[PDB]
Amino acid sequence: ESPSLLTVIIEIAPKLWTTFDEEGNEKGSIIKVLEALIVFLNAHLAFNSANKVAVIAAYSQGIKYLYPESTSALKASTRSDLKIINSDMYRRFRNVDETLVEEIYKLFELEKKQIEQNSQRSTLAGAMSAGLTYVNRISKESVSLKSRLLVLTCGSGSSKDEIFQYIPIMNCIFSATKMKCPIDVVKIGGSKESTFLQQTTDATNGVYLHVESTEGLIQYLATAMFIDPSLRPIIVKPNHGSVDFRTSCYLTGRVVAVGFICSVCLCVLSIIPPGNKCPACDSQFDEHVIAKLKRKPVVPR
Amino acid sequence: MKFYIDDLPVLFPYPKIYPEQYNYMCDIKKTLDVGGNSILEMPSGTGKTVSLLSLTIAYQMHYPEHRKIIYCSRTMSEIEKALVELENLMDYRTKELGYQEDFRGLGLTSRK
Amino acid sequence: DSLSKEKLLTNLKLQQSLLKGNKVLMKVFQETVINAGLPPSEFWSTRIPLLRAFALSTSQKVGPYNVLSTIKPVNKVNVNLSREKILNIFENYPIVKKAYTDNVPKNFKEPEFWARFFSSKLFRKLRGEKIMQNDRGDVIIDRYLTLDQEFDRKDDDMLLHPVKKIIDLDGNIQDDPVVRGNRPDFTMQPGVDINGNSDGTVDILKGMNRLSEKMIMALKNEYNDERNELKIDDLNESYKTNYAIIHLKRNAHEKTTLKVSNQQMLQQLSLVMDNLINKLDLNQVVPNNEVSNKINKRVITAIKINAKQAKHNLEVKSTLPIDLLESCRMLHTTCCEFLKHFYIHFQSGEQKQASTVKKLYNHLKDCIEKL
Amino acid sequence: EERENEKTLNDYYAALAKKQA
Amino acid sequence: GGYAWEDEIKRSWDLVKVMASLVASIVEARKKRTAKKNITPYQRGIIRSLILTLDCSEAMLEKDLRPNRHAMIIQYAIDFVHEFFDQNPISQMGIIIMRNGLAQLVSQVSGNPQDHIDALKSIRKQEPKGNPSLQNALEMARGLLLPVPAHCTREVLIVFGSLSTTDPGDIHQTIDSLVSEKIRVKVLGLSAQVAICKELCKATNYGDESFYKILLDETHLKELFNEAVTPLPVNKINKGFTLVKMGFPTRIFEDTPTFCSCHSKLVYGGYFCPNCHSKVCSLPTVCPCCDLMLILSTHLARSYHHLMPLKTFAEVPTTEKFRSEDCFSCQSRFPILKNHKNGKLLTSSRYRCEDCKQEFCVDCDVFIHEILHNCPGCESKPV
Amino acid sequence: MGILDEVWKHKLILVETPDAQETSLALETYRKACSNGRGAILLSVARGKVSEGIDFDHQYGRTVLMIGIPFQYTESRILKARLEFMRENYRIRENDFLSFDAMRHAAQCLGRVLRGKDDYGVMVLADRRFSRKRSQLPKWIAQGLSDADLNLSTDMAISNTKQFLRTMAQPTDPKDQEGVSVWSYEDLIKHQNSRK
Ligand SMILES: [Zn+2]
Ligand SMILES: [Zn+2]
Ligand SMILES: [Zn+2]
Ligand SMILES: [Zn+2]
Ligand SMILES: [Zn+2]
C-alpha cells in the first residue's frame, strides 16, 4: 500500500561476538546473523518495489554505513566486484547484498587493523541516532514515506547494562515518537532482561525479541520483525515480558522504588545523599525539607 | 565616564553617551573658549540638560578662572528637573572623585 | 485575608453555595460526610483550590468606568438597564444612590425612579451635557441637584492635594507674582455670554476631569523618586542576567541487583574472513523443520498472551446492573476518600492530630467491614 | 430527586450549627 | 499647473528596472545563526506550573488576524497545550480567560492535557466580549499558584490582545504581590507595547525586559508560542533546591476491569502506585490516594535535554581541508556549490561539532539540534 | 454628538483647566492613568501651561495629536502692532512671523515628548497648512519627516501608526546600535582618534 524504509542498526563487535562464540556450542555466529540479515533485507525489498533499505554497523571505534556505500566509493567504482554472492539472482537484491558484504569486508579489515586498542565505549546509541537522521533525510527528501528501525544487538552474557546509554537512547525514543518510526530490537545473548532497549521498543510501538541461538534467525525476522509500518495498527505485537519503565538510582545503582529526585538536574536517588548535597548538580539543600522527609510518620499509642 | 575634550576633563554621569551630546559639548567648549554668544539646537530625546550641566560644571572646576554659571529656564518645573539632573551629576562627581568638593547649587523662585 | 486556608475552611455559607452549585459533589458529600461521618474540615482540607476558585468566581468586581456614557437611547425609544449597570451607577455616582435611598423605599418604586432620573436635568449634568433652562427635567430629582453640587466641592475636598515639583503648574503660574503684562485675549480665556458670565462649558470640563480623577482615586484602596524619573534609561548599562549555571557529573553507579584475549579475538575474526570469502551460501538460513516449529510455537504463545492482554483496553460497558454498579461506585468513592484523608494525615505527621488519624483508621476498618 | 438530598443537607447543616453553638 | 490626472501617464510599466547569486541567500542565514552563537547550559526549572491567560474582549474581534484573534489564539493555545505537555510532562497547567472585566477559570490546575484541550474547545464556541482586566486575572493566577510547592517554579503566561485594561484596584500592589511570591510573568501582546505589561514583565522577571513579546505576523506567533514551552532559566538568588518524593508506578495488565482511584470508573488498564497500591488512569499525575507524584522514566528523559543543551554547530571555512565529502550521519553529498569557475569554492555546507570534530549537513544541523538531542559523532567517539 | 462616548470606553478624558491647581491635579491623574495601563488622553492647548516645561516621556506620550496649526488671534491689535514694528525695523514679513510663531509652538509641543533614544511616539499634525511649512520645523523633525508623509488622510495615517507601533515594540539588536546611535567609552576614544 505505502512504501517504507527499513534501517538496520546492527551492532558488530568482535569482543561481543567472540564471547557469544565461546558461550555457544557453534562458532562463527556473525556469519549466521549476517546471512539472516541479508535474507531479511531481500525479503523486505521483495515486500514492495519502492521500499528502501539502510544498514549501520556499530563497531568498537564508532559507526559505519553499509548500504548505501560511501559515496566516494560509489563514484570511483575502479573495480571491486568480489564474488561473494552469485550474480544470477534478482538484480535489486544483488546490488544491496554485494554492497553490504563489501562493506562488511572493508569494516572487518579496518577493525583488524585497529585490533590493538580495546574500547570500553559502545557505539550503539550513536548508530541509532545516525539511523534516525537517515530516517529524517529519507522522509523529508521524498514526498510521504513510512519508516522503521531494526537493532541487532548482542550482549553475549558479558556486556551488562550501561549507564551512559541511558541519556542518548532515551532522546532517540522521543525523536522516533516524533516521526512515528518504530524501533525494533533483536537481542542475541544470555542476558534475558535488557532494560533500556525494552523501554525503547515499548515506547516506540515496536517489538522486542530476545533469542538465544543464532541459527534459525530468519524465521524470527520474517515472522515477528516483518511488521511493515503500513500494517502496524492491525497487527498485535508478539512482545512478551512487558517492561516496567523504571530507572536506576545514582548513588546505589539499584532499581528504584518510591524515591527522591532533585529539582535541579532530575537525577534519581533511592536514598538521601550524604552531606545534604546532590551528587550530580552539586546543589546545596536546605535542612528543613530533608528533615521533614527523614522524619517518621505518626501513630498513636 | 571620564573623558577629555582638548585639555578639559569631563565627568559624564552615565556609562554611555550619545554622539549628539559629544558634538554639543565640543561646540559649547569652543564657544566658551572663543567667547561671544551662540544659539544651539539639541534634538529632544538626547540628554541636553545633563550634558550641558556636565561640561559647564567641568569647565568651571578645571579652569582656574572659576566662572560662575547662570542657568535660565522658562519654568519652575524645568528648574526642578535641572536641579535633579544637577543632583545626579554632583553625586556621580563625588563618587568618582571620592570627595565632596566646595559646591553650592540653589534654585530660585517666588515666596509662594 | 479572606483567601487564607482557615477562612475557606470556616466559610460555611461559601461551602453551602458551592454544594448548591456542584452536582457530583452532592453525591460525594452525601455518601461521605452525611453518612460515614467525616468532619467538614477534613473533607474541605483537600479541596481548598475548588473553594478558592468558587470564591474568586464571585468575589471579583469590574473596574470603574463611565457608566452614564454607555446609556444612550436605542416615536418610542428604549434603554436597557442591567443590574451590573445599576451597581456601577451607584458606585461611580453617590448622588444617584443618595436619591435611591430616600426615594425608592418611600414614595415611588424603582423603574419609576429610573425613568424620572433619565428624564431629569441631573442625568444631563452628570453625563456632561450643557444644562439648558428650556428643558423641564424632573421636579423630584432636581432638588438633589444643588446637593450634588455640594458633593462636587466635597470631591475637591478629597482631591486637592499637593503634588511634586516636577509637574507643579501652580508653581508655574506663581513663579513670579508681579506679572502684569498683556492680558490674554478671549481666545485664551474661557468663553462668556453676552452678559459676561460663563457659558458653562468649563463646568463640564471640570466635571469630566473630576470623573477621571474619581475613577483613578477609586483604585487606591485596600483591594527621591524624581531622580528615578529624570534619569535616562538608555545611557545606563544594559541588564546583565544573573541566571545560575549548573554542571552535571556523569559518575553514576553501575546497575546492581568474561575476559577474552586478543589472539582468540583475531583468530575468530580470521575464521570469519575465510568463511566470508569462499562461499556465502544464503540457503543455509532455512531451519530444519524442528527449530522452525519451536520458534513458531514460541511466537504463537507470545502473541496469544499479547492478544489476550490487548483484546480490550467514557467507561467501558459492564454486565453489572445500574443500581449495583452505582452502589459499588459510591462505596469505592468513599473508601478512596477515606484512604486519601488517612494517607495525607499519616504523612503530614503531626502528633497532635495523630489520634484523629486513628479515628480514620477505625473508619478504614469499617470500610473493610463495609466491603 | 435532589430536593430531598438538599433538604437533608440543610437539616445536617442546621444540626451542625446547633452543635458548635 | 493643472489637475493631477491630466499631467502625464503614470508609466507603471517603466518603473521596474532590470555567478555568486547564492551568497546573498547565505549571508542572511549566517546573520540568523550569528544570534545563536553564544550558548551555555543555563539552569532551568523543569517542574513548572503555568497559568495561561487568554484575552476575550471586544478588542479580540479585530480582523487584522485572519479569521479573528479569538479563534486563532484559541487554536494556537490548543497547540501550545499539546506541545507544553509533550515537552514538560510533569508540569501543571491552568487556563484563565479575561471576559467582561471578569477573570473566568475554565480549567483547574492539573497535569492532564486533555482537560485543557476540552476547556479550550468549549471556549472556542463562545464569542468574546467585554473590557479586559489584568488585575483580576493576575489575582486568580496568584490564588491558583498559592498551593503549588516551592520546588515548582510558578509561571503565568498572558496573551493580552487589548491595549487598555480596567482594574478594580491598584495593579502595582498586585505586581508587588506577584514579585513577593516569586511568580514570573511573560506577556505576549498582540498590538503594541502597553506600559503596565512591560513593567509587570520587568518586575516579575528580576529586571529582564525581554519577557514582553510583541509579534509581527502569523508565523511569529507560532515562533513565540514555540519559544514559550521551554522552561524559564532560574536566577542565582533562588535557593529552593528541594528534593521531591515520587514513585514510579507499574503498568498492570488485567482482563477484568476495575475501579480507578482518580475517576471512580471502569478502566481496563492502569498504573499501580508503588506507595499505596492504588491504580491511576493517566500519567504523570499526583496519586489521588497518597499525594505522591507518579511519573515514568521517559517523563524525566523528555525534559532531561534542557539540562545540557548541545553546543551549536560551526560552519567550516571553505579554505580548510574537508574531513569528509559525505555527511557523518546520512552521507549526504556535500554540494561543491561552484557558482562559477572564477567564483571558486564558496559557502561549503559542512557543519562541524566541537566535541567530536565531525561534519554534518544543514539537514542534520536542523535535526540534531531540535528533534534529536544527542550528536551521533559524540556517541560514536570511544571516550 | 457622542464622539467622546466612544473615547470613554478606551481612555479616560482629562482636560486642562485655567485654574492651575485643577490642571496640575489633572496632569498627575493623567500620569497615574498612563502608569497603570488604564489609558488616558490629555486635551490641552498649545500656548497654555501644559505645553511649556511639562514632559511626556516614555508611556506618557505615545501619541501627540496636534489639532491644527496654533496661530494666534490675528485681529488683536497687539499682534498686528508687533508685526508692523518688526516689518518696519527687522524687515520680517507678517505672514512669515505668524508662521514662525505657530510653528515654534507646534515644534515645542512635538519636542516635549522624546526623552531617551528608546522612546517612541507619533507626532500627527491635523491641518492642511502644515504641509507647506515643513522647512520651518526643526531639522531633526524635518529629517524624520519623509517626503511621502506630507498629505496623509485619516485611514492610512491609522495604518502607518499601527505599523510603527508594531515595529517599535520589538527588542532592537544591540549590534545595530553599539556605535552608531550610542557610544561607550572606547567608542568615544576611537571617534576622537579618528577625528585627530
Ligand atoms: Zn541535582
Ligand atoms: Zn498512591
Ligand atoms: Zn483517570
Ligand atoms: Zn546529514
Ligand atoms: Zn558531536
mmCIF file of C-alpha atoms in Angstrom, chain C residues 147-260:
data_model
loop_
_atom_site.group_PDB
_atom_site.id
_atom_site.type_symbol
_atom_site.label_atom_id
_atom_site.label_comp_id
_atom_site.label_asym_id
_atom_site.label_seq_id
_atom_site.Cartn_x
_atom_site.Cartn_y
_atom_site.Cartn_z
ATOM 1 C CA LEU C 147 -26.889 68.837 46.804
ATOM 2 C CA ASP C 148 -24.916 67.075 44.069
ATOM 3 C CA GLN C 149 -23.073 70.374 43.641
ATOM 4 C CA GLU C 150 -22.313 70.092 47.361
ATOM 5 C CA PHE C 151 -20.798 66.675 46.628
ATOM 6 C CA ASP C 152 -18.626 68.304 43.963
ATOM 7 C CA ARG C 153 -16.983 70.672 46.417
ATOM 8 C CA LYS C 154 -16.530 67.744 48.800
ATOM 9 C CA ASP C 155 -14.932 65.983 45.831
ATOM 10 C CA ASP C 156 -12.448 68.856 45.701
ATOM 11 C CA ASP C 157 -12.005 68.361 49.449
ATOM 12 C CA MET C 158 -10.778 64.832 48.716
ATOM 13 C CA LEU C 159 -8.868 65.683 45.522
ATOM 14 C CA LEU C 160 -6.928 68.917 46.148
ATOM 15 C CA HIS C 161 -3.597 67.636 47.476
ATOM 16 C CA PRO C 162 -0.072 68.999 46.916
ATOM 17 C CA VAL C 163 1.835 67.440 44.034
ATOM 18 C CA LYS C 164 5.509 67.062 43.192
ATOM 19 C CA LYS C 165 7.504 69.996 41.847
ATOM 20 C CA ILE C 166 8.065 68.145 38.551
ATOM 21 C CA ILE C 167 4.503 68.873 37.399
ATOM 22 C CA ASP C 168 3.590 71.746 39.738
ATOM 23 C CA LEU C 169 1.710 74.142 37.470
ATOM 24 C CA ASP C 170 0.550 76.302 40.374
ATOM 25 C CA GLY C 171 4.246 76.995 40.841
ATOM 26 C CA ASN C 172 4.432 77.584 37.090
ATOM 27 C CA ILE C 173 1.882 80.402 37.250
ATOM 28 C CA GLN C 174 3.196 81.726 40.579
ATOM 29 C CA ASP C 175 6.886 81.631 39.592
ATOM 30 C CA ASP C 176 6.743 85.415 39.811
ATOM 31 C CA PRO C 177 3.653 87.145 41.255
ATOM 32 C CA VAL C 178 4.368 90.526 39.643
ATOM 33 C CA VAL C 179 3.496 89.554 36.061
ATOM 34 C CA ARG C 180 1.282 92.378 34.824
ATOM 35 C CA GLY C 181 1.890 92.002 31.103
ATOM 36 C CA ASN C 182 -0.606 91.793 28.260
ATOM 37 C CA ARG C 183 -3.862 90.193 29.367
ATOM 38 C CA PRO C 184 -4.745 87.031 27.408
ATOM 39 C CA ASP C 185 -7.448 87.703 24.846
ATOM 40 C CA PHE C 186 -10.815 85.966 24.549
ATOM 41 C CA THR C 187 -9.242 83.068 22.635
ATOM 42 C CA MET C 188 -7.001 82.220 25.617
ATOM 43 C CA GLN C 189 -9.755 82.824 28.206
ATOM 44 C CA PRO C 190 -12.957 80.841 28.869
ATOM 45 C CA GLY C 191 -15.882 81.834 26.702
ATOM 46 C CA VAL C 192 -18.548 84.170 28.047
ATOM 47 C CA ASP C 193 -22.085 85.074 27.016
ATOM 48 C CA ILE C 194 -23.483 88.491 26.097
ATOM 49 C CA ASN C 195 -23.886 89.467 29.775
ATOM 50 C CA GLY C 196 -20.272 88.491 30.519
ATOM 51 C CA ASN C 197 -20.865 85.405 32.663
ATOM 52 C CA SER C 198 -19.511 81.984 31.725
ATOM 53 C CA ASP C 199 -21.366 79.784 29.244
ATOM 54 C CA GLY C 200 -20.877 76.630 31.337
ATOM 55 C CA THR C 201 -18.573 74.510 29.180
ATOM 56 C CA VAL C 202 -15.860 74.994 31.806
ATOM 57 C CA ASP C 203 -18.358 73.303 34.152
ATOM 58 C CA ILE C 204 -18.472 70.154 32.021
ATOM 59 C CA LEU C 205 -14.686 70.272 31.538
ATOM 60 C CA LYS C 206 -14.303 70.289 35.325
ATOM 61 C CA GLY C 207 -16.946 67.559 35.508
ATOM 62 C CA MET C 208 -15.099 65.184 33.200
ATOM 63 C CA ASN C 209 -11.790 65.981 34.930
ATOM 64 C CA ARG C 210 -13.480 65.221 38.260
ATOM 65 C CA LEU C 211 -14.907 61.971 36.887
ATOM 66 C CA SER C 212 -11.478 60.847 35.647
ATOM 67 C CA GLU C 213 -9.907 61.814 38.984
ATOM 68 C CA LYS C 214 -12.602 59.872 40.847
ATOM 69 C CA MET C 215 -12.015 56.788 38.682
ATOM 70 C CA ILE C 216 -8.260 56.910 39.283
ATOM 71 C CA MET C 217 -8.581 57.594 43.026
ATOM 72 C CA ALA C 218 -11.114 54.767 43.421
ATOM 73 C CA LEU C 219 -8.336 52.282 42.613
ATOM 74 C CA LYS C 220 -6.317 53.435 45.648
ATOM 75 C CA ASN C 221 -7.897 51.211 48.293
ATOM 76 C CA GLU C 222 -7.151 48.021 50.225
ATOM 77 C CA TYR C 223 -8.083 45.859 47.216
ATOM 78 C CA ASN C 224 13.986 60.616 45.668
ATOM 79 C CA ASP C 225 11.586 59.273 43.040
ATOM 80 C CA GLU C 226 12.192 62.377 40.910
ATOM 81 C CA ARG C 227 15.798 61.210 40.460
ATOM 82 C CA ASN C 228 14.452 57.910 39.132
ATOM 83 C CA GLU C 229 12.024 59.748 36.844
ATOM 84 C CA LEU C 230 14.600 62.136 35.362
ATOM 85 C CA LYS C 231 17.299 59.514 34.736
ATOM 86 C CA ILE C 232 17.723 58.338 31.141
ATOM 87 C CA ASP C 233 17.439 54.556 30.944
ATOM 88 C CA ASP C 234 19.369 54.140 27.681
ATOM 89 C CA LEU C 235 22.590 55.794 28.837
ATOM 90 C CA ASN C 236 22.836 53.375 31.771
ATOM 91 C CA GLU C 237 24.306 49.901 31.397
ATOM 92 C CA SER C 238 22.183 47.141 29.914
ATOM 93 C CA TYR C 239 20.737 44.434 32.133
ATOM 94 C CA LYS C 240 23.117 41.536 32.768
ATOM 95 C CA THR C 241 21.264 38.307 33.505
ATOM 96 C CA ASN C 242 22.122 36.683 36.840
ATOM 97 C CA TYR C 243 20.818 33.218 35.949
ATOM 98 C CA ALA C 244 22.560 30.263 37.571
ATOM 99 C CA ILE C 245 24.679 27.814 35.575
ATOM 100 C CA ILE C 246 24.915 24.157 36.608
ATOM 101 C CA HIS C 247 27.432 21.472 35.673
ATOM 102 C CA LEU C 248 26.419 17.810 35.554
ATOM 103 C CA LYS C 249 28.648 14.906 36.582
ATOM 104 C CA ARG C 250 28.169 11.538 34.876
ATOM 105 C CA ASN C 251 29.957 9.415 37.502
ATOM 106 C CA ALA C 252 26.830 7.410 38.292
ATOM 107 C CA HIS C 253 26.998 3.978 39.881
ATOM 108 C CA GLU C 254 26.576 0.909 37.707
ATOM 109 C CA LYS C 255 23.346 -1.062 37.943
ATOM 110 C CA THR C 256 23.353 -3.718 40.671
ATOM 111 C CA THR C 257 20.751 -6.158 41.965
ATOM 112 C CA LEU C 258 34.275 -12.915 30.575
ATOM 113 C CA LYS C 259 37.796 -11.789 29.672
ATOM 114 C CA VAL C 260 38.879 -12.655 26.119
#
